[PDB]
C-alpha cells in the first residue's frame, strides 16, 4: 500500500514528528569496516591465526576467557579514528538536526553514531561501547582510554587492583543490555515512524523492538533483504526499500528535499575529522 514516496510526504507534511531508528552492521560496511564473518579482509587474517571456531565466538564469554586475543584484535581495529561515518550516519545526524529524531537504537560498536555528531542523549548503544570497560573479576569500572595503550600494543589489559582481565563494555551473547536500553519502553509507543537500516534482525531482544510500535505506525526498512519480524509478521503500513542501504538512503533524502543540505554536512564533517 505505502511507498517510499508516501513515507517522505508524511515527513514533509509534518504528519510524522517522532522518528525512532534501528540500525545494524549494514550501515557501517561502506565506511570500510570489514564485516568480519566473511574471509576477505586483513582483519580476518589476523583472526585466522587464533583459536576461533567460528566468527561469533569473538562475542561469547567462554571463548573470551579461554582466549581474549581475538576480541582485542577487533577492539584494536575499531580504535577511534581508524574509521569515519558515512552518508547513512550523516543522514541520521541531519534527521536529528532537523528535529525529527526521537531516538537512534544501534547494534554497532564502532562508535560512528557519536562521531557523526548525534548527541549521546539521542542514542541507545544497545550492544555496548568501547567508551568504558569493566574488570571481569572485581567489577571495577574504567574509562576506555585507560586500556588504550595495552590494546594498541597487543597486550590483554589487566586490572591494576586484582590483575583480572579488563573487558570493554561490549554486550556479549548471554549478557544483559545496557541500562539505557530501557528507554524502549517509552520510545517505541511514542514513535510515529520506525526506520530500520542495515540489519538482519537476527539478535534478540533488539530484533523484537520492531513489533513495539503501534499498529498505525509505518515501518520503513532500508536493507538488502526483508528480514526478522518484518518478514514473518508483516503489517499493512510496512515499506520495504530493498537494495544497497546507501542507495535507499540517497533516494529517501532526495524525496525529502534534503540532498544539497546532506552533501554540505558530509563535506564539512568529514573535513573536521
Amino acid at each position: 500500500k505505502l511507498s517510499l514516496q508516501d513515507v517522505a510526504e508524511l515527513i514533509r507534511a509534518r504528519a510524522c514528528q517522532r522518528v525512532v531508528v534501528m540500525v545494524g552492521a549494514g550501515i557501517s560496511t561502506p565506511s570500510g569496516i570489514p564485516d568480519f564473518r566473511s574471509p576477505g579482509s586483513g582483519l580476518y587474517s589476523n583472526l585466522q591465526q587464533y583459536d576461533l571456531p567460528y566468527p561469533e565466538a569473538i562475542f561469547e564469554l567462554p571463548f573470551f576467557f579461554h582466549n581474549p586475543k581475538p576480541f582485542f584484535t577487533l577492539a584494536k581495529e575499531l580504535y577511534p579514528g581508524n574509521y569515519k561515518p558515512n552518508v547513512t550516519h550523516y543522514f541520521l545526524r541531519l534527521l536529528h538536526d532537523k528535529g525529527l529524531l526521537l531516538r537512534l537504537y544501534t547494534q554497532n560498536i564502532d562508535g560512528l553514531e557519536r562521531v557523526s555528531g548525534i548527541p549521546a542523549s539521542k542514542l541507545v548503544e544497545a550492544h555496548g561501547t568501547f567508551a568504558s570497560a569493566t574488570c571481569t573479576v572485581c567489577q571495577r569500572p574504567f574509562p576506555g582510554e585507560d586500556i588504550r595503550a595495552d590494546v594498541m600494543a597487543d597486550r590483554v589489559p589487566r586490572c591494576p587492583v586484582c590483575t583480572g582481565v579488563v573487558k570493554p563494555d561490549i554486550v556479549f551473547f548471554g549478557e544483559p543490555l545496557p541500562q539505557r536500553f530501557l528507554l524502549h519502553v517509552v520510545d517505541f509507543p511514542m514513535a510515529d515512524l520506525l526506520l530500520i537500516l542495515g540489519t538482519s534482525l537476527e539478535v534478540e531482544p533488539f530484533a523484537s523492538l520492531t513489533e513495539a510500535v503501534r499498529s498505525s505506525v509505518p515501518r520503513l526498512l532500508i536493507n538488502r533483504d526483508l528480514v526478522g519480524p518484518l518478514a514473518w509478521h508483516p503489517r499493512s503500513r510496512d515499506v520495504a526499500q530493498l537494495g544497497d542501504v546507501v542507495h535507499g538512503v540517497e533516494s529517501l533524502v532526495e524525496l525529502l528535499g534534503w540532498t544539497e543540505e546532506m552533501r554540505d554536512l558530509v563535506q564539512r564533517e568529514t573535513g573536521k575529522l
Partner: peptide, 7 residues
Amino acid sequence: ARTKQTA
C-alpha cells in the same frame, strides 16, 4: 529475551 541471544 532479557540477555543478548541469537533469534
